[PDB]
């Protein structure tokens, strides 16, 4: 099924801004590790589209973890010109886009299913995902 | 009370005995 | 004074007064005036402190009343939960626990009339 949502318990105010800020992130906790590309903003809509083939690629399951968080709506008005009212906000929830930001990390299935899985996902967006190891955790 | 008991007022329309009606 | 635990009758003769307690039937009172010799006529308010005491504890000692009665009372009730006896129902089903007719009255163990009905035959009656 599925139809609900997820964007803050309620209103949490309605206005933010911009940057590039060279993002970042710190290592991980799960096995595999997939970094991102390109500094910008993120659409929760993109997230979904990914995990779909991710999973049915994983018939028995697959299994993976995720590191992120929604942040603040958009601006874009329904045509006219410019102001603020109640438009461009409640229709697109974004999160911080750290270049190289650890989007997801991988588990259970080694670089057999995981790998190509990982790809398809990252292989799909407007960027690319990369490797991990151990390191400092 | 005509509809209760442990009295000789209700035991009448019933005709009992007990330690309540005999003699000796 | 207090003959039974936290219990007090007053401004009335002994024969009456007493009868409003737990285990206190219209007869146990008479047993308590022959061996105690106490004359029913005299009111509580005034009476030798012998009668006041040699009776007070005289009672609460001889056996059980309020509380101790009501307890063993419900105990029988619960102890009929053993595995679930027949008269152990009605008990656990808020209903008359000594055979009768559950096709009539007894709004005394249930409660008032919990109505709620609704049969809709054709309008020819």
């Amino acid at each position: 099924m599925l139809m609900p949502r997820r964007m803050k318990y309620r209103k949490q105010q309605r206005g933010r801004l911009k940057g590039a800020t060279k993002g970042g992130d710190y290592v991980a906790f799960g096995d595999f590790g997939l970094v991102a590309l390109e500094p910008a903003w993120i659409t929760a809509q993109q997230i979904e589209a990914a995990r779909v083939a991710m999973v049915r690629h994983f018939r028995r399951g697959g299994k993976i973890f995720i590191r992120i968080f929604p942040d603040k709506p958009y601006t874009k008005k329904p045509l006219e010109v410019r102001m603020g009212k109640g438009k461009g906000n409640v229709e697109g929830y974004v999160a911080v886009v750290k270049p190289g930001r650890v989007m997801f990390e991988v588990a259970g299935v080694t670089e057999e299913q995981a790998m190509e899985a990982l790809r398809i996902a990252g292989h799909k967006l407007p960027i690319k995902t990369k490797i991990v190891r151990r390191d400092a955790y | 009370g005509k509809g209760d008991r442990r009295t000789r007022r209700g035991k009448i329309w019933r005709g009992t005995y007990g330690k309540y009606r005999p003699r000796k | 004074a207090r003959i039974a635990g936290v219990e007090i009758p007053r401004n009335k003769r002994v024969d009456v007064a007493l009868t409003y307690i737990y285990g206190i039937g219209k007869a146990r009172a008479k047993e308590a005036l022959e061996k105690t010799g106490i004359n029913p006529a005299t009111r509580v308010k005034d009476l030798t402190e012998a009668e006041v005491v040699r009776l007070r504890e005289y009672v609460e000692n001889t056996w059980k009343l309020e509380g101790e009665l009501r307890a063993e009372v419900a105990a029988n009730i619960k102890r009929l939960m053993d595995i679930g006896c027949y008269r152990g129902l009605r008990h656990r089903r808020g209903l008359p626990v000594r055979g009768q007719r559950t096709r009539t009255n007894a709004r005394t163990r249930k409660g008032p009339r919990k109505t709620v009905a609704g049969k809709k035959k054709a309008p020819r009656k």
């Binding site: - | - | 004074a1 207090r2 635990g5 936290v6 007090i8 509380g67 101790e68």
Partner: protein
């Protein structure tokens, strides 16, 4: 006085400690902490005459004039209208707490809710202890006395005690058997 607790605790509750349990010494043992008494209702400025009277007896019954706590929200709320006052407070720790209780101990007690089988399992976390009740004539002097009255009440004691282990030391120190 000079009797009761005095020539009791100090004459015999001393050798209770001697061998029974080797705590240590006096100055360093559960003597006592304090004596706490209060009340709560709701009714009040229904006319305020409901307040002139309740307050008329409560304190005099106990034999000492305490402090008062009434009036808060003269409107709706959640927990009462009629003024929405409070109750009161009174306290001791001298030969006065000592007198009124000795009388309620072996006298008011007998005339109680089930003699053989007190409640000594209503204990806090250290030297605290709380109990609830409702009476008027349990006053060995004030037997009966103002049926035109009646009302509930709430009292509890406090002790230095290492734990409710020694609050219960006093339970069977003088009686109040564990509800059997």
């Amino acid at each position: 006085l000079d009797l009761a607790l005095k020539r009791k605790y100090y004459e015999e509750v001393r050798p209770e400690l001697i061998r029974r349990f080797g705590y240590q010494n006096v100055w360093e043992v559960p003597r006592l902490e304090k004596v706490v008494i209060n009340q709560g209702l709701g009714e009040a400025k229904e006319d305020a005459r409901i307040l002139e009277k309740a307050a008329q007896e409560l304190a005099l019954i106990t034999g000492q004039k305490p402090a008062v706590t009434r009036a808060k929200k003269s409107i709706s709320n959640f927990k009462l209208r009629k003024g929405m006052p409070i109750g009161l407070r009174v306290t001791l720790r001298r030969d006065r707490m000592w007198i009124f209780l000795e009388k309620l101990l072996n006298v008011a007690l007998p005339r109680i809710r089930d003699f053989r089988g007190l409640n000594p399992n209503s204990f806090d976390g250290r030297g605290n202890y709380n109990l609830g009740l409702r009476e008027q004539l349990i006053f060995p002097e004030i037997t009966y006395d103002m049926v035109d009255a009646l009302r509930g009440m709430d009292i509890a004691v406090v002790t230095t005690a290492e734990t409710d282990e020694e609050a219960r030391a006093l339970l069977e120190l003088l009686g109040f058997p564990f509800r059997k």
